[PDB]
Structure formats: C-alpha cells, structure tokens
Amino acid sequence: YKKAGSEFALDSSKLEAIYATSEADRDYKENAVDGDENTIWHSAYQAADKLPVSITIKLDKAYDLNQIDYLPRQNSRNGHVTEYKIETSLDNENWTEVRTGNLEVNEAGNALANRGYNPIRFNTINAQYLRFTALKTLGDTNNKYASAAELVFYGK
Numbered sequence: 136y137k138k139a140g141s142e143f144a145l146d147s148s149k150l151e152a153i154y155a156t157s158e159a160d161r162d163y164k165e166n167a168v169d170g171d172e173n174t175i176w177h178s179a180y181q182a183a184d185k186l187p188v189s190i191t192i193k194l195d196k197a198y199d200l201n202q203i204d205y206l207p208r209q210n211s212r213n214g215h216v217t218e219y220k221i222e223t224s225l226d227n228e229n230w231t232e233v234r235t236g237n238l239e240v241n242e243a244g245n246a247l248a249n250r251g252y253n254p255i256r257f258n259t260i261n262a263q264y265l266r267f268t269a270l271k272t273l274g275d276t277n278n279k280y281a282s283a284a285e286l287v288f289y290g291k
C-alpha cells in the first residue's frame with residue numbers, strides 16, 4: 136500500500152531547472168529534476184568556487200507545496216548537502232524563506248545517515264518557483280561544492 140503523501144509527487148517533466156550558481160562537467164542543473172536517479176547536478180569545483188550555491192526550479196503552474204525530497208548522489212559522496220535553505224516564489228523575483236535545516240549525518244559528521252531520499256517538509260505554501268541552497272556539504276573537499284541526484288516535489 137502507498138506511503139502517506141506519495142500521490143502528490145509531481146512528475147519530473149513538470150520541473151524545470153532555470154538557474155544554478157555554477158555547474159561542472161555534464162552534471163547540468165536540469166539533471167537535478169529529470170526523474171533519473173543516475174544523473175546529477177554538480178556545482179563547479181575550481182579554486183574560486185565555494186558555498187553557498189543555489190539551484191532554482193520552475194514548476195509548470197503554482198502548487199500548494201509542502202515537501203521536497205533530496206536524493207544524494209548515489210555513487211559518490213561529493214557534494215552531499217548537509218545544511219540547506221528553501222525559498223519559494225510566485226514570480227521568480229519576490230522570495231519567501233520557507234526553511235533552513237540539516238540532513239542527518241553519522242556520528243563523525245562526515246557522511247550522510249540516510250543515503251536515500253531525505254524528506255524536507257514545510258508548512259504548505261503556494262508557489263511556482265523553489266530555490267534550494269546548499270549551505271554546508273561533504274566532499275573530498277568539504278563545504279565547497281554541492282550535488283543532487285533528484286529533487287522530488289510534493290504539492291497539490
């Protein structure tokens with residue numbers, strides 16, 4: 136039987152990545168919301184690159200949103216987000232801060248506790264744009280670059 140809430144997951148074709156602070160290689164912003172667990176967005180990792188970095192997703196219409204799931208890159212820890220901010224907008228110009236938060240880490244504070252989908256819930260807000268910002272991340276250099284395999288959105 137279904138997980139409470141799962142019927143409200145939006146198809147990934149409804150999510151367009153319209154902005155990211157930077158990108159590396161072929162790890163395009165669009166890959167954070169292409170419904171493919173195997174493709175990632177990864178921000179750039181040259182000397183002047185640093186956190187924070189953001190990625191902005193446009194939905195096909197406004198929704199009443201109350202959750203996104205963050206899926207970490209599945210075959211490497213580089214860019215795993217550990218602290219994030221969520222903002223939303225109706226017009227891609229006036230932003231509301233909807234939450235900041237942390238994803239759980241291990242005892243050492245150097246690896247994610249949950250390698251799968253990490254739920255990020257917030258009070259329902261009508262929005263057509265959501266900006267996800269990586270404030271802290273893990274990697275072979277920590278707190279420098281972010282990645283995301285998927286951002287799954289829930290709304291009505």
Ligand SMILES: [Ca+2]
Pocket residue numbers: 147148149150151152168169170
């Ligand atoms: Ca998409």
Ligand SMILES: [Ca+2]
Pocket residue numbers: 166167168169170171172173174175176283284285
């Ligand atoms: Ca992907």
